[PDB]
């Protein structure tokens, strides 16, 4: 009965040369019982990508909530929300539930369409923004992801190289966690093309 | 309460739900129907806390029926499942949360496809080829992982379901007094009387 | 007490009419004309801006045509400030439905709720009604393309072609004359512009006094696109039909 | 005229017409009399019917074992005000184990009536009350007017033609004030008092209503054959 | 016009006619006075004996607030009681928070603000009373008079009601003839005289005199009613002066 | 014509209730005046005690709002005291909330905002008062800020209010045309008080005894009112020159 | 007690007019002239400082107000109504935007919020409409420079250039002759001063004229250094001296 | 966290480390613990990370509105009062431990606030898990009449004590100098004494190393 | 904390140490526990720093608003406002406050308000964790109508001992003198008071 580790799951984001990558596993379980191997944890609103780990009901709820909020944003602003602005919206929304929080570990990833700059950020369950040049990690195998990323990562990787690095970071981290894995998805994001790849990984 | 199962095959969704209602050291009833018809092509089974289960089921039933009358239209299984999820997701942070787990089996008439949704009391929704709530999953999931194929007929699905009930009747500690089986397809909802 | 100064906005006349609703409709009849025409492959929204000044910024302007969601838009006739209050409510309502059911809101459901809000201001609360009439243009997978209108009373109706605001009587007669069911979007565009051109209180219809929008399935395969016309695009479509 | 639309408006001469119109409802009411000695206090009331098929509207209400009143005007308003008095008497008993002084009872009614004369939306009470009681300072008689004005008296009368009884009691003052330790005589004086307000009608058995409270007498009401003694 | 039909409405003069109309209700009421003295204040009021049937001494009009303040008023009697009830609430909350009994100027503003508040809205009626009140606090004696508008000042002597002008003239003589000060016992006697002299303006019905006082030496700074020997002595002094 | 009874617009875009509240301002028939020195801000007002039965010490239209802020009112005393109590409460709350003494101009703005609300909201009448706030602000120095029933407020080099305000205003204007400066170039507040009384005497054309005047003085860290003898001392100094 | 006015004070007349809004616009007509001109690299808003008395210090009364670091406002009509609107406008830029998105609202949306506030004074119980028209000039990254007019009804319109108040009819005509889409900010300031002189009667200097611009970022007005992305306010109030410098080459 | 504040001749300087932890794990190696409330009032914050940022932003927002309302530059005591009353109201549940400093028309100021709403005044202060390492340095080297450059040295030395000796603190030193009459200068990463050494190996994988099941283009356009 | 207030011939003096504690760590060694709620009404604070500050701030606000309307409040009045806050919020407060002020009518007065929110008017009062160690000493050495110098010495010697034994107490001894002459602040450093 620890809300952040009932369902399991992980998300990781990385920056490269004029690109960003965000990846997640596919598992949804109930403690020991694996229930679904199709549960994707990455969503997008325009060109801004959001990954969410933690309690799956809150993952779903927050996706629906940020779709709601970004849709109204776009109608009033007459433009797509940028990663820096969306990051602030996520922080505000989470801190609004300061003493009754969503049990989640969200991760923002995307490229600012005006400046062309790659942007990633992470949050705790109550809204603290964690900005990084290199990588953000989240989920029940966050320790493992920290260890994988801190050693494997190098700056200014090309999209095709960055794919290999982030995939190997996720896969090997997931295999040391009982609650993570059961499939994986990687998003490679360039200024105006996004490629989504499903990874072959061990299914135990 | 206790055992609720669901299998989605080629053309239908089949729900099996245990018939026992046990309180203390007494089985009070052995013919309990743990299901409600939400709309002509949508059926919901439920298990969990006593009282909470039927109260929630009938509350959802009333709302979907209200919608049907207002719009002269049947909500899609996906739409109904999302409504139900949100109600449970609200509930979990209430003063007293509904402790009810549900399966929603529906036939989308616009898509001509069967659909099965598993939603727990927290509001955790997943679409599945086969689903279970409670301890049932610990036996049936692995069994179905082995024997299930996505192109099975309703008859093949029923045989696959017989295999699950047999396993549960062999290895489960409690006597759940068999199951009531219901099929959801293009022609609506019907009950198999001889199971 | 304060009884002395109460207009009693929500009462019946001896004839069984709602004073304030009738007077709000009288207000709307002076607002710039807006036309909606529903074709088999899309919907046209056309509206005339209220007497423009040459120093008005025309491109970054919105007065008549508003987007409610990706599938629904509205043409406004009446007080703009009143309309924006209602538009924001409608926008939120659409998102509530999407959040609840994970499906885009059916057009009529949105129209009914907005119309129900208007109705409330005529039956209780002692407040003046919203001096606004809407033309709703939208698409959903149940009824396809739909045109609706609502007015201060909170009454709404569906249309093949309809006008609101000024000169609706003359505009409706002209639409009734040239409209037919197998009509296409590009034909409807022409009818909309031709009707405004004949009913206008201005000397001649120009690009700077118009707002224009289409809702087509003219995207790529089985999906709907909203096109709020830019100034230059209205200038071109006005030349293409030979009005200027 | 232009200043009688509500209670919240003063007239140019400083009058409150709604309060005066409420006072008028009392004048249309059936006559009731109040008088006291040093040992007892007595209410006498002429009851009014709708016709010969109807009952006679009850005028006297008990508030506590030691207190009660008679009414003239809007009867529902008397029910509201008597109910309030019942609660105030009751609060005093439960909280302080104390019988509510008849004087405080007057002050409480005054302040309740007053609030209805200074706010928008409300209306003045349309009833006059004669409160009798026996407390720690002996027998008492109060006159309540819905203007808020409460007055302690040896004797009085309110309602239609109350001026006859009020004049009589003013003459009889020295006599009836010294009817101590004799209930039936104090009532006789009150019954003779109310008789000065009768026209074409006389006191019958289902017409007369008498109440009494005193030193060794709880507030009790007499109707029907129990008042035949006094006709 | 119509400016006088609603409270809180300014006329083109800048006047609130509804308050001025409430003043007319005060002018219609019986006479009441206040005399400030060496170490205290004295209050007196005219009680019209409408009928023989009124119990003497038993329709008390002067009211105490806290234990050190006395209040008397002319006009709508119920309105005066409402004001005193508020005064008692104000005084109680002051003593609750600050421990010390409410000073007279402090108490004066509490009533003033409350009465002024009833000239701000059309949903309430102004008070139909002018209230004379005062007592003894840490800074000595204070006498005040408060009017329907909310206006109040400190007074050497104060008078209101039907015989206010008669009483005012009599008060001014005392102020002129006693620059050093009037004693408490003297002021009680003078109060009786002035009420009797002010009764000439209401002489159809004969009346009942009611006096009270607060004095640092005579009543120990507390409000007390004048009764018995001291009252009859004051009545006799007044009776001798009218003849 | 109910547009003249409540604060809604007339056809010509006017608010008659606000205009009539301005006329209530002069109902007391008292004139006030404020000037600034180098170190101080002096405010003076006429004191008319017509009734011999009044306690003259309790008749005042100058109020000590806070230790640093003083306020003189032109208008009926009930509304005057209403404004004073609110101003006191507002200044006290400001100090508690924000940790420093409420500036004279900020209090003026706040009271002006409250006054504005009564011009827009129907159930509340305007107060028939003009409030002149004075202090020696720790940032802005000697300050005079004035509020009216319209909700208007502005700072002043000097100001006057009342029935004969225009005479005093031009008198002050003509002095500042001559002196070429924004204030009274004087060291002591005593002489700035003397200046204020002198120029009020010239403008009104009347002589004053010690009981015909009321004086408030604001210096750094305190605002205080003068006694009759303080004013008498000041009147003697003017006469002997 | 309590606000018993829970009903609308602005209602439709038989002819369809909303009386109180019309009358509010009449109040704006009586108000002193203010104007706004949009250049390619900035926006200028200007107005006359009508002094109530020569003893009054007109510097203490600001008609042109900063709303955000990149948005400014000026008005015509009733000053007190404007003052409280500025208070409310400044707050709503924070509560309904900055506290949510961590950045200041774009001009159109802040304008939209002010318009909402003014619309509600047209429909809510027991209130009259605001007796002001606003001109709001501002800049934001994705829309560039813009200029808006907000009327008592709550309606708002984007303008290349416009005037409101006393001599607005003549001033608008003057601006139509002079405005082109190639105006540089300094050219717009020059035209603003020319247009204002027509409506001003008495003294015409930097002490009787109030003028502010929305232009380049002002790092010197930021108050701190060290954050590269924070570059300073684009709103700047021209000083009394800066106005007089431009009145010589007029 | 380690955070400090030091007063000097003509103003005040505050500094902080840049480590953010979740249990024994370093979540952020370069987070910003120096917060701008107003241009010349800055806050150093230890405790719950989201709390220090939120309470600093809220009061900063309200301070801006107040400054605009009063036509005055904001005072440190106002930020101090608003922060303490907010924190007191929440009885310590908002875990913000702040060092509030800045210059205003009244002068230069240095305060600290504890999560429960207590405030104190000093010439030198330190908060956070590394405050004992920092305070040890401050108590050893502080003196009256420090210069600007002496105060920066003392402040950053006190932060370094925390970086090296406290496991809660690490990475870099941020500084903000608020001097009377001048603009506040925020010195982000003033010291960076913890640069990661060159790795022994590149772990760049041969392309094709990762097994893939599916590929697809994602539509981000409308 | 060790705090005290003592009445004497010319008025009253308040005294306090300067130690604020969080466990055995001294969070502040130069704390000012003597707090102004009015010109010549001050208090000594003990218990929770946050609680006593919040209370003192509210009281200062109340007395400022009192003064604006009714002039200078009595010391008794100030104590009553402290009491009202401490009594009504007893479940949520850890505050032991000594209130001390100078009237010209009443001269020096001391009121102590313990945890429960009761009020006790005394010739002198001691409070805080360190007070326990000086009950014996203070009772034996206090005399009524002492001189200024005698009262300063009495407080200095008393707090010196309280500081010596109580670990929670220490730093400097601050004092505030309240007389007709005005308000005087005194400070005494370890090197003086430790060797008494
Ligand atoms: Cl305000
Ligand atoms: Mg695994
Ligand atoms: Mg496994
Ligand atoms: Mg009003
Ligand atoms: Mg606590
Ligand atoms: Mg020690």
């Amino acid at each position: 009965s620890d809300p952040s580790s009932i369902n399991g799951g992980i998300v990781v984001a990385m920056t490269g040369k004029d690109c960003v990558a965000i990846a997640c596993d596919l598992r949804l379980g109930s403690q020991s019982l694996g229930v679904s191997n199709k549960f994707e944890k990455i969503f997008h609103y325009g060109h801004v990508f959001l990954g969410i780990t933690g309690l799956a009901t809150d993952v779903t709820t927050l996706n629906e909530m940020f779709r709601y909020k970004t849709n109204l944003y776009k109608l009033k602003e007459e433009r797509a929300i940028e990663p820096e602005t969306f990051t602030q919206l996520v922080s505000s929304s989470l801190y609004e539930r300061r003493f009754g929080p969503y049990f989640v570990g969200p991760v923002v990833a995307g490229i600012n369409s005006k400046s062309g700059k790659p942007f990633i950020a992470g949050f705790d369950l109550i809204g603290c923004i964690d900005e990084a040049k290199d990588f953000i990690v989240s989920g029940t195998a966050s320790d493992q992801l920290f260890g994988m990323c801190e050693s494997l990562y190098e700056p200014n990787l090309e999209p095709e190289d960055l794919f290999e690095t982030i995939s190997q970071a996720l896969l090997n981290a997931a295999d040391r966690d009982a609650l993570s894995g059961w499939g994986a998805v990687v998003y490679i994001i360039k200024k105006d093309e996004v490629v989504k790849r499903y990874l072959k990984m061990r299914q135990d | 309460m206790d055992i609720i199962l669901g299998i989605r095959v080629q053309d239908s969704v089949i729900l099996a739900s245990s018939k026992a209602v046990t309180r203390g050291i007494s089985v009070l009833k052995d013919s309990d129907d743990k299901t409600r018809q939400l709309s002509p092509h949508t059926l919901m089974s439920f298990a969990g806390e006593a009282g909470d289960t039927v109260q929630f089921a009938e509350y959802i039933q009333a709302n979907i029926q209200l919608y049907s009358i207002r719009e002269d239209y049947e909500l899609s299984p996906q739409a109904v499942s999302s409504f139900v999820r949100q109600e449970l997701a609200k509930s979990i942070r209430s003063r007293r949360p509904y402790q009810v787990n549900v399966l929603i089996g529906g036939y989308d008439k616009k898509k001509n496809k069967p659909e099965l949704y598993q939603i727990d009391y927290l509001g955790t929704k997943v679409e599945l080829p086969y689903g279970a709530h409670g301890y049932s999953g610990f036996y049936t999931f692995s069994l179905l992982d082995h024997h299930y194929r996505p192109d099975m007929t309703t008859e093949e699905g029923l045989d696959l379901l017989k295999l699950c009930v047999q396993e549960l009747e062999k290895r489960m500690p409690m006597d759940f007094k068999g199951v009531i089986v219901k099929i959801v397809d293009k022609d609506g909802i019907r009950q198999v009387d001889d199971f | 007490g304060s009884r002395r100064y109460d207009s009693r906005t929500t009462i019946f006349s001896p004839e069984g009419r709602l004073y304030q609703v009738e007077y709000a409709l009288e207000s709307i009849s002076h607002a710039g004309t807006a036309i909606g025409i529903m074709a088999s492959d899309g919907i046209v929204l056309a509206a005339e801006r209220k007497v423009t000044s040459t120093l008005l910024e025309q491109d970054t302007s919105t007065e008549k045509l508003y987007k409610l969601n990706d599938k629904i838009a509205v043409a406004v006739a009446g007080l703009t400030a009143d309309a924006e209050i209602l538009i924001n409510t409608a926008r939120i309502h659409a998102q509530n439905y999407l959040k609840t059911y994970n499906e885009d809101i059916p057009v009529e459901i949105l129209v009914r709720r907005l119309s129900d809000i208007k109705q409330g201001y005529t039956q209780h609360g002692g407040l003046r009604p919203f001096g606004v009439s809407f033309i709703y243009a939208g698409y959903d997978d149940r009824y396809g393309y739909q045109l609706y209108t609502s007015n201060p009373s909170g009454n709404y109706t569906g249309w093949k072609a309809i006008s609101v605001g000024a000169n609706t009587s003359a505009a409706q007669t002209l639409l009734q004359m040239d409209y037919k069911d197998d009509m296409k979007v590009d034909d409807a565009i022409e009818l909309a512009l031709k009707t405004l051109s004949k009913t206008t209180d201005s000397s001649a219809l120009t690009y700077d006094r118009l707002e224009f929008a289409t809702i087509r399935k003219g995207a790529n395969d089985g999906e709907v696109y909203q096109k709020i016309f830019k100034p230059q695009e209205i200038k071109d479509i006005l030349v293409k039909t030979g009005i200027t | 005229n232009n200043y009688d639309g509500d209670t919240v408006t003063f007239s140019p001469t400083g009058r409150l017409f709604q309060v005066e119109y409420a006072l008028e409802a009392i004048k249309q009411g059936s006559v009731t009399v109040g008088l006291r000695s040093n040992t007892h206090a007595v209410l006498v009331a002429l009851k009014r019917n709708a016709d010969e098929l109807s009952s006679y509207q009850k005028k006297i209400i008990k508030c506590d074992e030691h207190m009660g009143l008679s009414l003239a005007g809007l009867a529902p308003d008397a029910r509201v005000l008597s109910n309030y008095l019942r609660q105030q008497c009751n609060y005093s008993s439960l909280v302080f184990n104390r019988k509510l002084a008849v004087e405080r009872a007057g002050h409480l009614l005054c302040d309740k009536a007053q609030k209805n004369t200074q706010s928008y939306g409300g209306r003045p009470y349309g009833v006059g009350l004669l409160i009798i009681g026996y407390d720690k300072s002996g027998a008492h008689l109060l006159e309540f007017q819905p203007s808020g004005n409460v007055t302690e008296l040896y004797g009085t009368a309110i309602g239609a033609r109350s001026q006859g009884a009020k004049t009589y009691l003013e003459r009889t003052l020295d006599t009836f004030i010294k009817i101590d330790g004799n209930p039936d005589e104090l009532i006789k004086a009150g019954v003779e008092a109310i008789s000065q307000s009768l026209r074409d009608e006389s006191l019958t058995v289902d017409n007369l209503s008498i109440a009494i409270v005193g030193k060794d007498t709880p507030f009790t009401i007499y109707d029907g054959e129990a008042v035949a003694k006094y006709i | 016009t119509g400016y006088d039909l609603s409270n809180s409405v300014f006329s083109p003069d800048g006047r609130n006619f509804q308050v001025e109309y409430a003043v007319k209700a005060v002018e219609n009421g019986t006479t009441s006075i206040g005399i400030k003295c060496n170490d205290g204040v004295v209050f007196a009021v005219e009680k019209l004996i409408t009928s023989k049937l009124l119990v003497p001494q038993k329709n008390v009009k002067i009211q105490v607030v806290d234990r050190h303040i006395g209040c008397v008023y002319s006009g709508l009697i119920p309105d005066g009681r409402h004001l005193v009830n508020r005064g008692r609430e104000e005084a109680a909350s002051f003593k609750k928070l600050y421990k010390t009994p409410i000073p007279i100027p402090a108490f004066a503003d509490r009533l003033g603000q409350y009465v002024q508040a009833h000239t701000l809205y059309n949903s309430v009626r102004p008070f139909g009373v002018s209230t004379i009140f005062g007592g003894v606090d840490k800074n000595g004696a204070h006498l005040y008079m408060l009017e329907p508008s909310g206006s109040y000042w400190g007074y050497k002597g104060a008078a209101t009601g039907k015989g206010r002008q008669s009483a005012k003239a009599e008060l001014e003589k005392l102020v002129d003839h006693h620059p050093e000060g009037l004693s408490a016992r003297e002021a009680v006697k003078q109060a009786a005289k002035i009420i009797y002299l002010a009764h000439e303006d209401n002489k159809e019905k004969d009346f009942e005199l009611e006096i009270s006082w607060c004095s640092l030496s005579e009543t120990n700074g507390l409000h007390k009613f004048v009764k018995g020997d001291l009252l009859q002595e004051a009545i006799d002094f007044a009776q001798k002066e009218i003849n | 014509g109910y547009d003249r009874h409540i604060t809604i617009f007339s056809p010509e875009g006017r608010l008659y209730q606000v205009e009539y509240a301005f006329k209530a301002t002069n109902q007391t028939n008292i004139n006030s005046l404020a000037v600034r020195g180098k170190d101080c801000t002096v405010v003076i007002s006429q004191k008319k005690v017509p009734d011999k039965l009044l306690d003259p010490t309790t008749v005042s239209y100058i109020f000590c709002i806070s230790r640093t802020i003083g306020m003189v009112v032109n208008g009926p005393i009930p509304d005057a005291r209403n404004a004073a109590l609110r101003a006191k409460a507002e200044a006290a709350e400001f100090r508690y909330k924000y940790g420093y003494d409420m500036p004279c101009d900020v209090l003026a703005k706040r009271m002006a905002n409250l006054s504005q609300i009564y011009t827009q909201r129907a159930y509340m009448r305007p107060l028939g008062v003009i409030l002149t706030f004075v202090s020696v602000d720790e940032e802005l120095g000697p300050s005079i800020y004035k509020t009216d029933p319209a909700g208007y407020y502005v700072g002043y080099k000097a100001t006057a209010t009342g029935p004969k305000q225009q005479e005093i205003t031009t008198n002050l204007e003509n002095h500042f045309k001559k002196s070429k400066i924004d204030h009274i170039n004087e060291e002591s507040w005593e002489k700035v008080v003397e200046f204020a009384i002198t120029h009020m005497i010239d403008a009104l054309g009347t002589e004053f005894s010690k009981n015909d005047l009321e004086v408030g003085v604001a210096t750094k860290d305190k605002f205080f009112t003068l006694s009759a003898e303080n004013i008498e001392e000041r009147l003697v100094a003017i006469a002997e020159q | 007690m309590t606000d018993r006015y829970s009903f609308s004070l602005t209602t439709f007349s038989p002819s369809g007019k909303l009386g109180q809004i019309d009358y509010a616009l009449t109040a704006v007509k009586q108000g002193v002239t203010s104007l706004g001109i949009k250049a390619t690299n900035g926006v200028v808003i200007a107005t006359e400082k009508k002094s109530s008395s020569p003893l009054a210090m007109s510097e203490t009364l600001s008609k042109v107000s900063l709303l955000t670091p990149d948005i400014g406002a000026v008005y015509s009509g009733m000053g007190p109504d404007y003052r409280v609107l500025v208070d409310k406008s400044r707050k709503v830029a924070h509560t309904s935007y900055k506290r949510i998105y961590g950045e200041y609202p774009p001009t159109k949306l802040l304008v939209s919020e002010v318009a909402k506030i003014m619309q509600e004074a047209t429909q809510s119980g027991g209130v009259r409409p605001f007796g002001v028209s606003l001109l709001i000039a501002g800049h934001d990254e994705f829309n560039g420079f813009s200029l808006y007019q907000v009327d008592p009804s709550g309606s708002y319109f984007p303008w290349k250039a416009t005037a409101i108040g006393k001599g607005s009819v003549a001033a608008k005509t003057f601006l139509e002759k002079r405005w082109n889409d190639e105006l540089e900010l300094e050219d717009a300031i020059h035209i603003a001063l020319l247009t204002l002189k027509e409506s001003v009667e008495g003294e015409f200097n930097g002490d009787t004229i109030e003028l502010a611009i929305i232009g380049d970022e002002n790092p010197d007005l930021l108050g701190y250094t060290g954050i590269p992305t924070d570059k300073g306010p684009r709103f700047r109030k021209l000083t009394s001296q800066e106005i007089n410098d431009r009145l010589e080459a007029l | 966290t380690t955070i400090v504040g030091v007063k000097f001749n003509n103003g005040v300087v505050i500094a902080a480390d840049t480590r953010s932890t979740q249990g024994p794990i370093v979540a952020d190696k370069n987070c910003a613990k120096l917060h701008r409330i107003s241009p010349k009032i800055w806050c150093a914050g230890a405790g719950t990370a989201a709390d220090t940022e939120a309470v600093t932003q809220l009061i900063g927002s309200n301070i801006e509105l107040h400054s605009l309302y009063t036509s005055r530059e904001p005072r440190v005591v106002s930020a101090l009062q608003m922060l303490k009353q907010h924190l007191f109201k929440y009885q310590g549940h908002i875990g913000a431990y702040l060092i509030v400093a800045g210059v205003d028309p009244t002068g230069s100021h240095l305060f600290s606030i504890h999560a429960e709403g207590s405030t104190d005044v000093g010439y030198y202060l330190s908060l956070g898990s590394g405050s004992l390492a920092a305070m040890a340095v401050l108590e050893s080297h502080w003196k009256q009449d420090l210069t600007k450059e002496e105060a920066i040295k003392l402040a950053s030395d006190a932060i370094q004590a925390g970086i090296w000796n406290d496991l809660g603190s690490g990475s870099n030193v941020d500084v903000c100098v608020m001097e009377i009459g001048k603009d506040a200068e925020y010195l982000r990463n003033y010291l960076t004494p913890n640069v990661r050494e060159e790795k022994q190996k590149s772990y760049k994988f041969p392309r094709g190393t990762t097994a893939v099941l599916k590929e697809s283009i994602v539509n981000i356009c409308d | 904390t060790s705090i005290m207030a003592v009445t004497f011939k010319d008025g009253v003096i308040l005294g306090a140490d300067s130690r604020t504690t969080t466990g055995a760590y001294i969070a502040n060694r130069v704390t000012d526990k003597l707090t102004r709620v009015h010109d010549k009404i001050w208090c000594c604070r003990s218990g929770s720093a946050a609680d006593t500050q919040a209370i003192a701030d509210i009281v200062q606000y109340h007395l400022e608003l009192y003064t604006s309307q009714y002039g200078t409040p009595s010391t008794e009045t100030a104590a009553s406002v402290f009491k009202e806050l401490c009594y009504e919020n007893k479940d949520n407060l850890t505050a032991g406050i000594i209130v001390a002020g100078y009237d010209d009518k009443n001269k020096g007065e001391v009121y102590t308000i313990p945890l429960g929110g009761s009020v006790h008017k005394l010739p002198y009062a001691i409070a805080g964790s360190g007070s326990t160690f000086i009950y014996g000493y203070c009772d034996k050495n206090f005399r009524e109508n002492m001189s200024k110098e005698e009262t300063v010495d009495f407080i200095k010697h008393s707090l010196s001992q309280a500081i010596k034994w109580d670990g929670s107490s220490g730093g400097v001894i601050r004092m505030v003198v309240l007389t007709a002459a005005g308000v005087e602040r005194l400070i005494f450093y370890p090197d003086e008071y430790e060797q008494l």
Side-chain angles (χ1 to χ4, degrees), chain A residues 174-175 177-178 180 204:
Chain A
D175 291 349
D177 183 22
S180 298
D204 63 349

Side-chain angles (χ1 to χ4, degrees), chain A residues 106-141:
Chain A
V107 176
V108 166
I111 296 151
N112 190 294
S113 67
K114 209 82 190 292
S115 69
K117 282 163 185 284
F119 184 90
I120 53 166
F123 316 78
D124 58 16
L125 83 166
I126 53 166
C128 178
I129 301 160
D130 165 29
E131 218 183 83
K133 294 181 178 226
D134 42 18
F135 53 87
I136 296 299
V137 303
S138 190
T140 48

Side-chain angles (χ1 to χ4, degrees), chain A residues 27 173-182 201-202 204:
Chain A
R27 192 174 175 276
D175 291 349
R176 279 287 167 181
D177 183 22
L179 303 186
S180 298
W182 254 26
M201 74 173 293
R202 63 186 304 115
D204 63 349

Side-chain angles (χ1 to χ4, degrees), chain E residues 57-91:
Chain E
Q57 265 63 36
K58 275 303 251 274
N59 287 298
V60 186
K61 290 181 84 175
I62 300 169
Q63 283 185 279
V64 64
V65 172
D66 203 298
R67 264 125 94 155
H68 68 299
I69 305 165
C71 301
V72 72
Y73 40 79
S74 300
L76 305 186
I77 298 307
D79 279 21
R81 278 193 52 80
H82 178 98
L83 192 54
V84 170
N85 287 144
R86 178 71 185 200
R88 289 162 173 175
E89 286 170 19
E90 295 283 9

Side-chain angles (χ1 to χ4, degrees), chain F residues 3-4 8-16, chain G residues 19-20 22-24 26:
Chain F
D3 61 315
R4 310 214 167 199
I8 58 162
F9 290 115
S10 70
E12 45 276 338
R14 287 163 62 177
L15 298 173
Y16 284 103
Chain G
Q20 288 296 309
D22 286 352
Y23 306 159
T26 295

